[PDB]
């Protein structure tokens, strides 16, 4: 589990590339499993920036 921005969720899949897949969290090509994601703006945003 982790927090990312809404543009980045497509990098969390087998064989992908880009800043998150490159430098933060990499899935294998032989990945068996499920990727579950949801918007958390109601908790994880704040005025002036979280």
């Amino acid at each position: 589990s982790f927090v990312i921005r809404g543009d980045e969720v497509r990098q969390i899949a087998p064989g992908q590339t880009g800043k998150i897949a490159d430098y933060n969290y990499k899935l294998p090509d032989d990945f068996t499993g499920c990727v579950i994601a949801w918007n958390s703006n109601n908790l994880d945003s704040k005025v002036g920036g979280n």
Binding site: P14, G15, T17, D29
Partner: protein, 50 residues
């Protein structure tokens, strides 16, 4: 004229090897017939399908 029996055995084996080598120029529906070229144009999972 009579040696055509032995020359035909030489010719048939040469045509069969030239055909086998010429078939490396074919795409078979892939983006390129060149294997390094595919690996440069596409990322891992898309290259694997080609």
């Amino acid at each position: 004229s009579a040696l055509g029996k032995l020359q035909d055995v030489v010719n048939q084996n040469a045509q069969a090897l030239n055909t086998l080598v010429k078939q490396l120029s074919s795409n078979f529906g892939a983006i390129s017939s060149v294997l390094n070229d595919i690996l440069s144009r596409l990322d891992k999972v898309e290259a694997e399908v080609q």
